[PDB]
Structures are given as C-alpha cells and as structure tokens.
Design an enzyme around this catalytic site. Structure first.
Site, mmCIF file in Angstrom:
data_model
loop_
_atom_site.group_PDB
_atom_site.id
_atom_site.type_symbol
_atom_site.label_atom_id
_atom_site.label_comp_id
_atom_site.label_asym_id
_atom_site.label_seq_id
_atom_site.Cartn_x
_atom_site.Cartn_y
_atom_site.Cartn_z
ATOM 1 N N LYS A 17 0.814 -1.264 0.078
ATOM 2 C CA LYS A 17 0.049 -0.108 -0.019
ATOM 3 C C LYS A 17 0.932 1.057 0.084
ATOM 4 C CE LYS A 17 -4.401 2.143 1.810
ATOM 5 N NZ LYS A 17 -3.555 3.419 1.681
ATOM 6 N N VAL A 35 -1.364 1.558 -5.183
ATOM 7 C CA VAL A 35 -1.990 0.468 -4.563
ATOM 8 C C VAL A 35 -2.948 1.068 -3.285
ATOM 9 C CG1 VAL A 35 -0.966 -1.300 -3.122
ATOM 10 C CG2 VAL A 35 0.128 -1.063 -5.182
ATOM 11 N N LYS A 42 -6.354 -7.617 -1.037
ATOM 12 C CA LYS A 42 -6.286 -8.637 -2.084
ATOM 13 C C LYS A 42 -5.031 -9.385 -1.906
ATOM 14 C CE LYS A 42 -9.833 -7.546 -5.528
ATOM 15 N NZ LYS A 42 -10.760 -7.204 -4.475
ATOM 16 N N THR A 89 -12.086 -11.240 -26.410
ATOM 17 C CA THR A 89 -11.429 -9.814 -26.835
ATOM 18 C C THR A 89 -10.044 -9.995 -27.372
ATOM 19 O OG1 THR A 89 -10.843 -9.585 -24.558
ATOM 20 C CG2 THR A 89 -13.035 -8.930 -24.923
ATOM 21 N N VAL A 110 -9.084 -11.456 -29.765
ATOM 22 C CA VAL A 110 -9.059 -11.084 -31.106
ATOM 23 C C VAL A 110 -9.191 -9.636 -31.565
ATOM 24 C CG1 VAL A 110 -10.518 -11.857 -33.236
ATOM 25 C CG2 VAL A 110 -10.598 -13.507 -31.349
ATOM 26 N N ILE A 123 -12.393 -7.524 -31.896
ATOM 27 C CA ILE A 123 -13.331 -7.667 -31.103
ATOM 28 C C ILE A 123 -13.114 -7.090 -29.478
ATOM 29 C CG2 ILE A 123 -14.629 -9.824 -29.740
ATOM 30 C CD1 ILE A 123 -14.093 -11.487 -31.895
ATOM 31 N N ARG A 133 5.636 -12.030 -30.548
ATOM 32 C CA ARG A 133 6.366 -11.004 -30.523
ATOM 33 C C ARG A 133 7.122 -10.973 -31.601
ATOM 34 N NH1 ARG A 133 5.770 -7.168 -27.174
ATOM 35 N NH2 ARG A 133 7.957 -6.242 -26.875
ATOM 36 N N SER A 192 9.113 1.228 -29.039
ATOM 37 C CA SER A 192 10.316 0.988 -28.387
ATOM 38 C C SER A 192 11.463 0.080 -29.306
ATOM 39 C CB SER A 192 9.842 -0.447 -27.454
ATOM 40 O OG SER A 192 9.376 -1.571 -28.266
ATOM 41 N N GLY A 247 6.067 -5.518 -30.513
ATOM 42 C CA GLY A 247 4.864 -5.991 -30.427
ATOM 43 C C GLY A 247 4.124 -5.761 -32.085
#
Ligand SMILES: *[C@H]1c2c(ccc3ccc4ccccc4c23)[C@@H](O)[C@H](O)[C@@H]1O
Ligand SMILES: [Cl-]
Ligand SMILES: [Cl-]
Ligand code: NA
Ligand code: NA
EC number: 2.7.7.7
Length: 325
Positions: free
Chosen positions: A52, A57, A64, A93, A95, A98, A141, A172, A181
């Site tokens: 935290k 955070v 959690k 998602t 895809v 989508i 990648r 990048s 990517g």
DNA sequence: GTCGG
DNA sequence: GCTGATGCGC
DNA sequence: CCGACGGCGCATCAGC
C-alpha cells in the site's frame, strides 16, 4: 519476476476482467498501474500494508494481496475463472477487432470460441475476420532482427515512391528494444504541412502491397493506415508470421513532435511534459507552445528536429535508448 | 480502484 | 443520403 | 464527497 509475479499476474487478470467483462475501463487502468509499480519494486512483498505504500496501490488491492499471500489465491478470481460466460467474454477480446462490446454480444448468442467464430464469418466485420485469421500471429512478439529487415523494406519502398518522404520507425524499437509487438511508422513529406494531399499515404501503402510486404488492411484513411505485413520467406524456409503495422502521415511542421511522442517511453514523455511546463512550455503529440503568465498558450514554436524540442525546454538531447524514463 | 481537490 | 455517436486499437 | 483518470483516426452503427 519471481519476486512478486504471483501478485502482478493476479492484478493483471483482475485488470482484464474489469475491461472486458465489467467494462470498467478506469478499474482496468487502476489494476494495471498497481501491477506496474509492483513489477518494479525490488523486494518481495510480505503484506498488503507494505504494498500500500506504493503509489497506485490502495486499500482494496492491499486486502487482495493479504488474501493471496495467506492462501496463494483470490476467491473472486478463482470464481470468475470458472464462470463460463465471463471467461469466454474475456477470451474473445483477444481477437483484434473484438472489444468488450462485441465479445459480450457474441457470448450472448452462444458464440464463445474461435471455432464458433470460424463458423460464423457472416457475423464478423472485416477487421474481426483478419484478427481471427491471424489470432496466433498477432500474439507473437517480433525479434529485433526481423524488425530491422522489416525496416529495410519500408525505408526502401518509401524512398522508391518519392525520395522526399521521411519515414521513421518509432516505438520501443527506436529506443533499441530486443523485441516489438508491432511496427509503427511515422511518415512526412515537405509538401504536407499543417496549413496547406490524400494520395501521400495511399501511394506508400500501395507500393508496400505491390512488393507484397503489406498483406491486409484493417483501416486506411488519409493520415493513418493500420494493417498486416509479412517478411518474404527465404528459400525452402518456414513462413514468417504476419505482423501488425501502422503507418502515420504527419504534417512536416508537426513531424518531430510526433516522432518524439511515438518513440516514448510513456514515463519519459510525462517527465518531459512536466519539465516543459516548468520552463513555460506545453508539449503535446503535435506541438510545443509557450505558456503566458496567465496560462494562455501561445502560437506553436518552429520545430525542425527532435533536438529543437529539447533546446526549447533547455534539456540535453537524449537518444531514444536512454528515454526509458 | 486510487488519488486528491 | 447525411451527421453524430459508439467501438476499437493504440 | 466525488470527479479525474493523456484521446485520436477510422469503421460502423444509430437516428434523422
Ligand atoms: C492513455 C492511453 C492508454 C492506452 C493506450 C494508449 C495508446 C495511445 C494513446 C494516444 C493518445 C492518448 C492516449 C493513448 C493511450 C491508457 O492505458 C491510459 O489510461 C490513457 O488513456
Ligand atoms: Cl450467465
Ligand atoms: Cl496544438
Ligand atoms: Na498507495
Ligand atoms: Na480485441
């Protein structure tokens, strides 16, 4: 990675469910931010209280983390994972084309897997069909070596169309990343400026399709192209995977702000925009403007290079490899 | 979900 | 037929 | 307490 991988994997999975299933974009970004800051933390977290202390955070994520640390799991995540509808929506998602909305629509009508998508082509728009076709390729990648070969082809064909074009592969990759990517290309031409042609982009896309580099089109306008490309395969060699490529046409007088912006990183851009304001300048994707004493931004300043931007805010020109922050 | 005016 | 809103990717 | 949380180009939808 081994340090807090369990925590960050947990936060990212929660992030995806918020975005794709609950359609709570702000919670998605919150979880991502929490995952990032923790990803960088050079210590193994022992409790939520410790976590935290990190910016991003809060109380909820702290709780959690405590649950995960004491049980190795998160009850809500285990439950959502076993949920047929939610897990399917989240999956679809992946895809391209989508999003949360289409994935929910599909799942509501019984379409829950790629196989279901494959037998319902009539229900997919053009983008979604391509995203489906290259599902696996798009998740892979790109090794920097392939990016270099990809670059060779782009610069060559761009110069071939008109030697006056100026193309820069940003992202990048420009900062020297080992893998990418996708490929993001920024294009300009002296005949194109803020206050002054539709074919400038089209002609480039066309040449790239002629030498069979670009294989598919997701979207194409007068200033932005989004598609698919593929390196030619060597003799008797396995076929290279299809890759995502974007090509942006930018007014010459805004080109260098664009290159700077699209090279990043994100943290660097924020640190630069901050320092920019400190010196009485406003830097955005397009231009750098002077800030008056009352906060009124003046006319755009002359930019003829990336360095020019650095000079304005009196900063040492940094090369993309050192622009990580 | 987290932050901060 | 057009204009503005929404989804999507980034 | 409660609004902010980089949005922008293009494809497609919603509504006139
Ligand atoms: C900013 C932001 C996000 C994600 C992707 C993305 C890609 C390009 C640009 C360009 C201009 C404005 C914003 C973006 C983004 C988000 O993760 C983030 O919360 C911001 O909305
Ligand atoms: Cl259900
Ligand atoms: Cl502007
Ligand atoms: Na915190
Ligand atoms: Na998607």
């Amino acid at each position: 990675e081994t340090l807090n991988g369990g925590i960050t994997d947990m936060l990212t999975e929660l992030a995806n469910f918020e975005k794709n299933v609950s359609q709570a974009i702000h919670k998605y970004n919150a979880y991502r931010k929490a995952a990032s800051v923790i990803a960088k933390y050079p210590h193994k977290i022992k409790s939520g209280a410790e976590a935290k202390k990190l910016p991003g955070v809060g109380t909820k994520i702290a709780e959690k983390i405590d649950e995960f640390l004491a049980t190795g799991k998160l009850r809500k995540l285990e439950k959502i994972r076993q949920d047929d509808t939610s897990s399917s929506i989240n999956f679809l998602t992946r895809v391209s084309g989508i999003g949360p909305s289409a994935a929910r629509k599909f799942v509501d009508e019984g379409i829950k897997t790629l196989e279901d998508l494959r037998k319902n082509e009539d229900k997919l728009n053009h983008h979604q069909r391509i995203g489906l076709k290259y599902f696996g390729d798009f998740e892979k990648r790109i090794p920097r070596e392939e990016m270099l070969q990809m670059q060779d082809i782009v610069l060559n064909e761009v110069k071939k169309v008109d030697s006056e074009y100026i193309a820069t592969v940003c992202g990048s990759f420009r900062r020297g990343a080992e893998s990418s990517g996708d490929m993001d290309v920024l294009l300009t031409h002296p005949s194109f400026t803020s206050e002054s042609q539709p074919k400038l982009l089209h002609q480039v896309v066309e040449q790239l399709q002629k030498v069979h580099f670009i294989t598919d089109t997701l979207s194409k306008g007068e200033t932005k192209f989004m598609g698919v490309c593929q390196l030619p395969s060597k003799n008797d060699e396995k076929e290279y995977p299809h890759r995502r490529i974007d090509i942006r046409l930018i007014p010459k007088d805004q080109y260098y702000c664009g290159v700077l912006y699209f090279t990043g990183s994100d943290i660097f851009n924020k640190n630069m925009r901050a320092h920019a304001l400190e010196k009485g300048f406003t830097i955005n994707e397009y231009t750098i403007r002077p800030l008056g004493v009352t906060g009124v931004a003046g006319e755009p300043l002359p930019v003829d290079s990336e360095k020019d931007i650095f000079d304005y805010i009196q900063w040492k020109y940094r090369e993309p490899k050192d622009r990580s922050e």
